[PDB]
A paper describes a structure:
End-binding proteins (EBs) autonomously recognize an extended region at growing microtubule ends with unknown structural characteristics and then recruit other factors to the dynamic end structure. Using cryo-electron microscopy, subnanometer single-particle reconstruction, and fluorescence imaging, we present a pseudoatomic model of how the calponin homology (CH) domain of the fission yeast EB Mal3 binds to the end regions of growing microtubules.
We used cryo-EM to determine how the CH domain of Mal3, the fission yeast EB, binds to GTPγS microtubules, which were previously shown to be static mimics of growing microtubule ends (Maurer et al., 2011). The Mal3 CH domain contacts four different tubulin dimers, providing an explanation for how the CH domain distinguishes between B lattice contacts and the microtubule seam: the binding site is formed by two adjacent α-tubulin contacts (toward the microtubule plus end) and two adjacent β-tubulin contacts (toward the minus end). This configuration is not present at the seam where lateral α-β contacts exist. However, strikingly, we also observed an enhanced layer of lateral contacts at higher radius in GTPγS microtubules. These enhanced lateral contacts involve tubulin helices H3 that adjoin H9 of neighboring tubulins, presumably because of a structural change—possibly a positional shift—in the H3 helix of β-tubulin in the GTPγS microtubule. The structural change in the β-tubulin H3 helix could be triggered by nucleotide hydrolysis, sensed by H3 via loop T3, which might be mimicked by the presence of a bulky group such as the γ-S-phosphate (or BeF3−; Maurer et al., 2011) occupying the γ-phosphate-binding pocket. We propose that a structural rearrangement of the β-tubulin H3 helix results in two topological changes within the microtubule: first, more pronounced lateral contacts between neighboring tubulins, and second, a concomitant establishment of a high-affinity binding site for the CH domain of EBs.
Residue numbers in the entry:
A (entry chain B), B (entry chain F): 2 to 37, 47 to 439
C (entry chain G), D (entry chain C): 2 to 44, 47 to 360, 369 to 437
E (entry chain I): 4 to 120
The structure:
Amino acid sequence: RECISIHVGQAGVQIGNACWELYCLEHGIQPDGQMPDSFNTFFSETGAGKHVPRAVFVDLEPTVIDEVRTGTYRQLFHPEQLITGKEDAANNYARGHYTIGKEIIDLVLDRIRKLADQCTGLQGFSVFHSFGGGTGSGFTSLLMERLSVDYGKKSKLEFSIYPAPQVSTAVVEPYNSILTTHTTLEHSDCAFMVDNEAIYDICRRNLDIERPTYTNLNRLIGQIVSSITASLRFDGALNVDLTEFQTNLVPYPRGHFPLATYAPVISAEKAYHEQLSVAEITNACFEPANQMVKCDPRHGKYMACCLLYRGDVVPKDVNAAIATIKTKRTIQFVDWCPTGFKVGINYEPPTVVPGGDLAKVQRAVCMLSNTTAIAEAWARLDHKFDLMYAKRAFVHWYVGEGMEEGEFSEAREDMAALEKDYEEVGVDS
Amino acid sequence: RECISIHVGQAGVQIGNACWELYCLEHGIQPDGQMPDSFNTFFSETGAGKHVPRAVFVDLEPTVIDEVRTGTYRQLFHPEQLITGKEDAANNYARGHYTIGKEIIDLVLDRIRKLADQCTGLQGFSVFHSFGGGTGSGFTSLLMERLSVDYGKKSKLEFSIYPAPQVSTAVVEPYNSILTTHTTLEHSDCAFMVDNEAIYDICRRNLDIERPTYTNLNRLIGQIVSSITASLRFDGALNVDLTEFQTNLVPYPRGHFPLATYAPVISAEKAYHEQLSVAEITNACFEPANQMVKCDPRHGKYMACCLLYRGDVVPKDVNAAIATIKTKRTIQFVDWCPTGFKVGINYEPPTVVPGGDLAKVQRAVCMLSNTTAIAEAWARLDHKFDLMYAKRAFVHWYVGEGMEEGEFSEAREDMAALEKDYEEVGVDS
Amino acid sequence: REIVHIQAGQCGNQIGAKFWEVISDEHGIDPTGSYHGDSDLQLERINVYYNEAAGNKYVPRAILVDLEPGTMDSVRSGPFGQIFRPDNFVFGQSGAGNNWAKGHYTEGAELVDSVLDVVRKESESCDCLQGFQLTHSLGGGTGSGMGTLLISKIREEYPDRIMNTFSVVPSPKVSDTVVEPYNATLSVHQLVENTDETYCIDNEALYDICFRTLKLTTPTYGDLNHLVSATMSGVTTCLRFPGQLNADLRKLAVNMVPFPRLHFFMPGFAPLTSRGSQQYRALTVPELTQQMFDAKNMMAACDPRHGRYLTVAAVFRGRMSMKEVDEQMLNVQNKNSSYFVEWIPNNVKTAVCDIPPRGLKMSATFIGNSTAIQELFKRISEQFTAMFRRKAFLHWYTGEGMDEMEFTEAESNMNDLVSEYQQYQD
Amino acid sequence: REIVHIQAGQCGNQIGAKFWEVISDEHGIDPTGSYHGDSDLQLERINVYYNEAAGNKYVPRAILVDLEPGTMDSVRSGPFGQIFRPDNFVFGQSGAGNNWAKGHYTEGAELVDSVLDVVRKESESCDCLQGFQLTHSLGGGTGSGMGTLLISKIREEYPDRIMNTFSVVPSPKVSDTVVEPYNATLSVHQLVENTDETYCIDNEALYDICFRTLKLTTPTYGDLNHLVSATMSGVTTCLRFPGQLNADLRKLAVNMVPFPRLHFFMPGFAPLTSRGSQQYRALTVPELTQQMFDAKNMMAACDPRHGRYLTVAAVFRGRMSMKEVDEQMLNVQNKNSSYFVEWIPNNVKTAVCDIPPRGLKMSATFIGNSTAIQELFKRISEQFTAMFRRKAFLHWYTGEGMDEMEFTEAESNMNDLVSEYQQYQD
Amino acid sequence: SRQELLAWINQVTSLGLTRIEDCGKGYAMIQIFDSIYQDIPLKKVNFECNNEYQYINNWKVLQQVFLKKGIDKVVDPERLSRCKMQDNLEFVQWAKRFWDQYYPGGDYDALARRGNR
Ligand SMILES: Nc1nc2c(ncn2[C@@H]2O[C@H](COP(=O)(O)OP(=O)(O)OP(=O)(O)O)[C@@H](O)[C@H]2O)c(=O)[nH]1
Ligand SMILES: Nc1nc2c(ncn2[C@@H]2O[C@H](COP(=O)(O)OP(=O)(O)OP(=O)(O)O)[C@@H](O)[C@H]2O)c(=O)[nH]1
Ligand SMILES: Nc1nc2c(ncn2[C@@H]2O[C@H](COP(=O)(O)OP(=O)(O)OP(O)(O)=S)[C@@H](O)[C@H]2O)c(=O)[nH]1
Ligand SMILES: Nc1nc2c(ncn2[C@@H]2O[C@H](COP(=O)(O)OP(=O)(O)OP(O)(O)=S)[C@@H](O)[C@H]2O)c(=O)[nH]1
């Protein structure tokens, strides 16, 4: 195997409710928990007639976790597993990590130690957080922190929603994201990344809708994610374990962050049009306008991709569609890497929301990868930071929250060697 | 086997009414005495329809015993067996032991000699008192006193409710408890202890309710106690006689005081949640937040535990769940005791009040034990004493009641060697 | 042939119910019914365990000794519980305290005469007596103390008839009691000097052998007991059946005890396969010796592989070739020459009944006298000292009229007993 | 006789299902059923792959080794999946990480003893053991690492019985994994020094041979597997049939390995015609040699035409003239004198069974030991260095308790292995 | 790797150890702690230990040292006592790190501490 999941921060919780929705939806388990091993690596058979959740929920304002215990699904989780700190969220790392966030952690852990025990030989914890938040950046920082020590012997794949390249929200965002990166870096196994803005494009350009509610982006990651755990931990013609990832996906200890991408994003109402070919979707994967991340392969050489397919797919179709790609060159893969294509084949096709806006094809490609591209994304996000730090901007908000000129300046230097790292492991031969 | 019981002091009587309730409740004997050997070691089949209790009740104010002869159960005991001294209670040892309490004792004894005769080869008297009271500390002191001589050839397990660590009631409490300890010490066989405050925690943390009426704590001990006598004196896959206890439970003549602990404390309303595993409850037993005693194993090395199980339990499950424990070393290490785990297995699962607040599982663990831990609890209670004695505080209240500078100072020295005793038998190898 | 079982204590008693549960079916004797025996051979030798009174009521000739009513009143109030003549129940309504001293010197010593009384009524039954079967646990009062007395008296009354002892030596990992080594060391002492054949079983050697050699997930006591009772049936009763080469308690004794201590064995059953699936039938014979002679599968705690053998007795009971039997035994004796002691050219004592365990095709009880059991009395003996040193729960013994030199005695004795056993491992 | 298959990893496992899917039908063994055999000859030699227990249940004598439950739980939850005795399933619920090091030193090393255990239970089955069949992929954990260990242990336990290895060497064009050359180079290393007959198959040499030699447009894995399993049946099982001139693993080994490396072959099936149409029946014989000896049709990636042969073994199985067989082979040896090495007057090892593949009239398995396979280990070896140089995903190995000298070792070894093979191409 | 660690351990302790599994006994782990702390009851530790019961004592001793010192690191005796390679490999790796940081300048005589056992 299983893989627990800790959805931290309002966002990580909204996305959580979403990814958690898509789940039962493709497993025939109504919001009442009941369906009429396989998928046991994400659901515990509490007896009994029910299913329950194999995860937890951590937010410092009740508002968001509250809504879960109102709307059907209310029945799905255990009243217990949804942790809250009535106190204050605070869009600031410090407070969430140190000062406040601290008080809850114990309790938090307890569940990921109480839920981690009940199972049978697990594989890790799929963590869901929103980089630039208070409860999402800070808190987790120490949650993943306390995990890397309590279970160093497992997988720590954290699924993040890192800062929109130009459309950020919080005024401080970078402070909170240069801080969640440096503290988690030395603790994660593989950090998946899905860019909030670069997903909108997909909603504008590849689905058409200027009315994208957060509830949609969530349905999307809620999809790409389903391709990761759900179906993969599910039997198939070319299974891929969680460990598999980090192994076939990270060339170096830095909790390396690949990018999530999905192939068939086409709007219902298009739903009837003749379906796309195994070749087209494959090709769509090499287009910088369909990757849930504003890290357009502006130069970033891929260094490993895990093409997770699902649905009706002939291994030759793949071991050909990929061959064609391996020789497009304009898709330049790293040097020190001969072949970096982990072909993951599942059976059961995707499963689109009954009536959202997702096409509903009979095959998809959730390809994720490490690309020297993020050399950018990190850069552009680091620079941000400086500008403000350069004037201390909202610094007094953290200091007064148990932090110091140290943690900032010393977490800046941190990422600095992440701009050099993602530079050295590539661009050079 | 039988075992008579003498509930002394309002409290010991409230707890009595409670433990006495749980009884019939799990033996199908309505308050009218009638049910439609086995359990004969606690109930005499008097007349040809009824089940007159097998105990007595001793309080110097009528108030509390009076209430018993109002509320159904009124029918349960014999009008006789509920002793009272219309006179005065007095929250002071002296008066209750010497002066007043004396007058009643004879009469009291008479019943525990009249009820002790009627039976068939008994095993002892389960005494119920509240350490820090007037009728509970003093009186008993001489009751148990007069027993150790009239039946030295039996078991004297006194079930006490010793002084809340910070939430005491009486202003003098320690005077009354350093005095009931020294006088009973050289007379009891095994003294069970249940801390009033440390039980509240359980009601706050393991059941959730800031509305715990005394009537609840009573339902609780009323439970842990049911696991002692009731069910144990009741057939099973691994029976454990009363003698058994003191033998497998006291390493030394000091009327050693183990602690009572219960495993499944979970609130109704939780009542549906998937039940807990044999391993979990077992483990819950080694948590200092579930032991009816503010003696958190702060260092106190266990020296003997009597794991009384009840309900559906496979001996291997135990002779494994315990094995896992034997190798945790939570306790830390004294050399001298290789194995100190008396596994008591009963059949019939617990029996929760129809609608109180107790979960109602199909298996429980009422583990009691002697822990070098009380080295604390006694300490902290002894110190109390001094502070006041150091100024004589309410001394004139006892002196004027047939006591002397002797009994105090000489009962202080007493416990002193109980602080050294509980220290020597442990902490050293 | 004859013999007279003895259910000392609760355990020894609980097991009685299982030993008789079995044996009866292995002799077609229903509760109070008679011989429904699918065959006619399960009757010509029954006498060994019953008596003729009515003509349909062959009553088990055992003794039920215990100072705790509830127990025998659970065995007498359940299934086969109503086959024992009430005269058999020698109860002691006293306080069956968990003290070896309380059931050997103070409480049991009284109930003894009222026992010996019957053990004589049964011995003087008829024909010729062979010996007595004794079940109990060396970790309690009515078991180690009072049962260990019952024998010390038996062995004074008929130092001729044999004395097999089935002891449930205190399991390692976790003990089902606290003074355990006290009640134990004290009873082993009495054993090494009265009974002349002891079969030590370990509640946890069973679990293992019962949870991995029988995918059985919920091994209740009834089971363990059941497995044990399976072995004691192969031993006795069995050999009281025909066979190409049959033996009987003595042969077993006179081939297994090189030196008078009495020595303790470790029983092992043959076909021990999980129900459905496993029913591999790989029971040609090499499969049974494969079984019996492996580490796991030895009801004992210790592992043979940890010490030579002095004697072995494969008491098979199911039609087989005196060739594929006599043969196998050999290779076995040569593949493991290492551990099998040398000063005995043929350690193994091949025995061969004919009729097998009612529903099975071929089985073979194993009674090993290995030097490995050294590493158990060691255990026990250790636990003692570690706690004796501090006189732990000693007041419950002395206060019952005991001696500070009594405990010394036993430990030493039984402790020396460890010593000796090594004298052959080398 | 006999042999005992070994399904190491998922692939090696997935294929197990296909190798047994086939073989069974080529032996009339239904799921749990028995021998429905259309004939009576598909039984006198079965033993080679089964065991007698019930009388209708001849269970495949293979081993299923894997650290990923889901897999074996897909093979055991599907078609023939319910024929293997559960004892065969040696799973490792651990994290079957895709690391050679994780299934050879850290995770697999534990599950090994619980495997060898069975590999012995099966070896000591009966009669006389010949060798073990080994399936797996050299591009993963449970495959290259743990399976490559299974043999290193097997070859220490019976350096007498043979060891055929069926490896799915990392296909060129596209790698179905990323560290591939890591998991590979490391396993080939172990191979060149334990097993003594290896049949290397390439998922893409198959596609080709399966999409152009079988107009098959959607070649699912099941297929590839199926084709492969078709060859391994012609090899073993087949020769365990009668024949004018029959051979058996050894002959195959003792005629195909000039120099101890172990050398790897490249299997090729005979009638490989598309269903309907193609059913040309041009199978007189010159048509089979036409087939077998062409470039395409060699399950290997490399093309024979790119390097001499040392040995060849046309293991035919279908009634034919020892003349039109022995003859053809010759012209073939002369039309291509160029590539066929000279210091071996008769490279070819003609073998001839009688009964053919159930539904076919005439087939012939080809087992070539050509020097061409040099150009594959080269490939692999290259990929290594290009990435080793930068220690690419090396932390996943070392961090699992590995050595920086371990990788060095293998590459070199296997790298030298390339060298040698050229020593004959010249 | 296993080879590297074993070489390091053997030199430090002056031990014979052929394989990592040998560490399962728990003696070596206690002695490693002794080199750092020098507080361990070495006489009590069963250095030579043949039987599992003995291993448990070593573990208890190890556990106590952790507790006394306030060492947070987890020790899963159940896993280690089995003498399985992976569990021990992991524990040993951590211990080495612990030793590297903690070990003081003072010289340590492993043989003497053992009593030459
Ligand atoms: N995809 C997606 N992004 C979201 C969602 N909710 C918020 N975000 C993004 O995540 C960031 C917002 O984090 P916040 O909601 O401010 O904070 P938090 O991380 O929940 O924790 P706190 O600051 O303490 O409240 C912004 O960059 C948002 O664009 C959501 O439901 N889906
Ligand atoms: N658990 C429990 N504790 C009780 C109960 N009643 C009283 N106590 C505790 O016992 C002590 C009170 O003793 P009192 O009621 O003052 O006196 P008494 O022992 O009945 O005798 P007198 O002083 O002569 O009235 C306090 O520490 C209370 O917290 C009860 O029903 N349950
Ligand atoms: N195999 C087996 N072991 C048993 C059984 N009953 C008890 N034991 C084992 O026997 C020992 C204690 O036996 P027990 O039956 O309590 O003796 P007793 O003399 O009757 O006990 P007491 O009356 O003095 S408390 C423990 O080690 C326990 O594990 C049983 O039915 N089968
Ligand atoms: N022919 C064939 N090749 C297969 C099959 N399954 C996997 N492969 C090939 O084997 C290699 C990986 O095999 P795989 O089955 O993943 O090994 P594994 O050890 O079980 O993998 P893991 O558990 O460590 S991730 C790839 O080169 C892939 O192309 C199969 O069923 N047939």
